[PDB]
Design a protein around this ligand. Structure first.
Ligand SMILES: [Zn+2]
Ligand SMILES: [Zn+2]
Ligand SMILES: [Zn+2]
Ligand SMILES: [Zn+2]
Lengths: 84, 122, 84, 122, 84, 122, 84, 122
């Protein structure tokens, strides 16, 4: 769990999303909610978890779609992107 | 305590939970009631789990949720609400009894789905 | 890792599928391939991993769709289903 | 050893890998070549990883694969082939050089995608 | 994550302890601390996490030692033990 | 901001942190200072991480901690304190500067180890 | 799973060992055995898994002890060590 | 098929499995037999699992194994053998019946512990 989007390559952020998907189906949300808090903190997107649970119909509801939307928003707001 | 589910619920559109943060929230879908009616549950929690799993199996309702929320319901957990409807640690849709113990615990006609924000106001 | 489909509730099989999804995005397939061998062995479906990587266009490409197809096939062939 | 990608590849339909188990297999998509051309890689393995990641970013190609295979390519791994095209531990599409070292290691026009079964026959 | 010690066989509680050991060496304590809160809640031992990080010199500092101390304390206080 | 570690610390017994919840807490072990002296760190956090890793490598100090706490220090994290010395979310030993910015950030002689409870009182 | 000891910092190798410890207590050895094969391959120690299951009485039976023995052996044989 | 454990086993030293790769291997410890005697098991596999778990609970035997092997036995799995005693995928101690079905499946006096290498020779 890095404390900055700049520390994540696109592939590593996808791994983070699949870890969240695994906790989604776990018995409880104890672990899930901690991963989501981290996701919201580093992404800095105003809609937070909506990127995961309420994806825009204008893009794919997939780990790849989530990364693309984050990339576009952070770029449009002059924020550092994923680690190249 | 245990009991059996009763009730008929109500027909819903393709925007079932759109009004979960208003008034008494969204009602129990009649197709869902048909699957849960006359079934015994050890507790309301057991009911809540079976409820969401049934929602994940109904094509007309599952299509109204994202892939991540569908996975949540598939294991009995309530779907996450929009960020704007959360309240503290409560970040998922909750079931609310219209007529409290003062009852009908498993009365699907006395049960509805509401958001955390709205539930607190109630 | 149970050694029989009858030991898995539908929810638990979904957890197995999300574990496979996590290994899908891991650096290597070392762990993934072991989980897939197990998946193929207990499911007993002739198409094996195709249920995961080559889903029929007549059903959803999701953990839920995979479980439903397996349920239908095992039932149609007189094989025991998921643990109720 | 390192080098730079060269070549133009070829235009492909919505069934790109349908003939990966026949003849020399499927060619490098021209849209993919455009993204990899003139880029340096430490090894062919590095090329292979970047190749698949590029495929996952091309909407016209990613739609030809399932969600699980798209996730594989997104991290640089080759997609899994159909069960019928595997051979032992080799269960994913492989890149084959038409003209071996006897060369063009990063020559996208001398590279193609083939299934394990077909690769062994070659 | 069961919400009762009675739901855990001794072997399953050991798995819980090894999961905690894995998070112990993770980059941060975000996940670890949630697992520890759960551990403290179900065990009901007044010393809580001390059973893990400050084991009595009168027993083994191992997953097996932790389980034995918990078994002895819960039995001595008339509380339900591990699932047989 | 970055800087270099300086100082000599102090000799400690086999109960190094026994007085971490009293006065200014426990001092930086002189054997540890010898390993960190003259080394550059990007931040105090970087120092804190290297500090604990060094403690895990010193046989005389590691033996004073349990297996779980040793694993924590081995990766740069502070050991967990006893339940009685915690305070809210702060459940691990903390480093305290005797003379604040009003300084010596990397001055090992101006640094000590204290428990959450005691740190708050200070 | 890196394919070289030089890609692992001492802390990261410890994480690898705790992952192996977790699989040690799993229901089966399917995953465990793959992690062990990887461990044996990158370490290149003639005794392989003995470093984990049959530690010398001259050192600690701990993740830290395992790393130290590997460091000493690879150094004594002129092989590259852990990533600094 | 199911059955009940019978037998007395034999007393062992602090090097119980030192001769598991010779002759018929090591015998079932008498202290272990005392705990398993007269107990019913659904299969030999069930017996094997309970066997190792019992070994992990006996202080005199658990001390003869490393921390990693003790964890294995604690969950019912056989301890790993030394690298030199393995054979292919068989890398853990195995239980061998002296008198095959030609019997005594749960007869602890007809059961012993042997290494893969030695078992194959037998
Ligand atoms: Zn209510
Ligand atoms: Zn070739
Ligand atoms: Zn301070
Ligand atoms: Zn035999």
């Amino acid at each position: 769990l890095k404390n900055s989007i700049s520390d994540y390559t696109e592939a590593e952020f996808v791994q983070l999303l699949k870890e969240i998907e695994k906790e989604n189906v776990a018995a409880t949300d104890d672990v899930l909610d901690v991963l989501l808090e981290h996701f919201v903190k580093i992404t800095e997107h105003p809609d937070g978890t909506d990127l995961i649970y309420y994806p825009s119909d204008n893009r794919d509801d997939s780990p790849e779609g989530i990364v693309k939307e984050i990339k576009e928003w952070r770029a449009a707001n002059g924020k550092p992107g994923f680690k190249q | 305590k245990p009991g059996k589910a009763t009730g008929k619920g109500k027909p819903v559109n393709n925007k079932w939970l759109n009004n979960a943060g208003k008034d008494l929230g969204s009602p129990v879908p009649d197709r869902i009631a048909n699957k849960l009616r006359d079934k015994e549950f050890k507790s309301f929690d057991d009911f809540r789990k079976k409820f969401w799993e049934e929602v994940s199996k109904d094509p007309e309702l599952s299509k109204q949720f994202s892939r991540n929320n569908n996975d949540r319901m598939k294991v009995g957990k309530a779907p996450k609400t929009r960020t704007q409807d959360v309240s503290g640690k409560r970040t998922s849709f909750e079931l609310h009894h219209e007529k409290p113990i003062s009852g009908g615990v498993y009365d699907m006609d006395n049960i509805s789905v509401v958001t955390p924000k709205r539930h607190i106001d109630i």
